[PDB]
Amino acid sequence: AGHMEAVIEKECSALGGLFQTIISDMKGSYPVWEDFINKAGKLQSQLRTTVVAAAAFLDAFQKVADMATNTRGGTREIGSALTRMCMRHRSIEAKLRQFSSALIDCLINPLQEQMEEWKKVANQLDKDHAKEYKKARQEIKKKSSDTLKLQKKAKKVALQDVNDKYLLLEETEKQAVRKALIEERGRFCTFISMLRPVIEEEISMLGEITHLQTISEDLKSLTMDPHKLPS
């Protein structure tokens, strides 16, 4: 570590420092992504259990509907309407299953796999940059040297080559930063492509709720004046 090496390193690293910020950010990100995969996993397992409970509940709901259908007068119409309501909830259950499936198959498992690949890709970006950077450096530590001795034996009575290699390093670093910015953004794009089908299933599941209102109104109509006999 000399004075000439400090000056040179002060020049170079000023160029390639945004790179290290992006890289450091990516390398520090994994615990956040890991906790996400963990909590998503725990939600999906809980949704699977809820689906099983929902299906058993709907079996019992249907038995209640059947019981009304097997009474006599106006109670038979109540039963048919309860049956409709049960069928509508079964459709909602089937979409919840598809939502739960997309959550594990489209998001959790793929994000988990993508994780080790992200770590390897960031390691390599960092490694390759380090290489290009420090050979670029040592080659300009070497050209400033040649210029030093050439300037101290000419005053007893190459400079452009140093300048070349600095503009050279400027565009190297520019390209490395472009590459890191694409990888950084790309991780989120990838994550969002995985998220998309999960949210589509959620929208499809919610959309099945539109059929409940008509049935609830019918049930309301069929249960007016419970103190007297209908027609």
Added chain:
Amino acid sequence: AGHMEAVIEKECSALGGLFQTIISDMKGSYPVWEDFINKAGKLQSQLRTTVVAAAAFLDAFQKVADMATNTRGGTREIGSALTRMCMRHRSIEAKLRQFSSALIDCLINPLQEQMEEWKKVANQLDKDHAKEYKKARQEIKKKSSDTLKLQKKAKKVDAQGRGDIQPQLDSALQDVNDKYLLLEETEKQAVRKALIEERGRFCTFISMLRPVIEEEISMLGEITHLQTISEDLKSLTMDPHKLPSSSEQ
């Protein structure tokens, strides 16, 4: 007790039978109702656990959004859009909690308390009917008894109990028929009450179920917002292999 009475008798028997059927059907209904309560309880318990797991997931999702938000260029916009997605999901989570609460407050617990009161009311309707039926038969027995008195004292046609006793005997027989009709009316009203109670049980159930379904229906308002945010996310993640104009500074 002649032809007309025997006809009424069989209607009373049909009605009496129908009343006992309705009472028996009500009495045998409880295992189905109890199974429904049990399974609604089991679902509500899992929904409670789901809502906690959903909130923890959303906390993690928001940390991911924060991470993107605090990077550079277009990735910051992606973070902002992800935050909009996460906040909209907090609204869905809230509605899920409301549905879970309504399921227990409006349906499971009320239905559970209702069981014993349904049993008491059905049993009382049965006992009231038996009491009224007994009285009606007694009335028929008493008038058929007098018509036996009259009819035995009418066989003595030697005191001209024919222009005087026969009008009496005609009315005595009429009164008997009156009592049979009264029994029939008692049976018809018993059936009516039993039918009303049978239907009323399902009316009660529906009244408990409807506010639960209302909380579910309230989730329709969320859909348009998920659609818009998902279109924004798609637009923000175009050409992942390339730098967006937003990242070129």
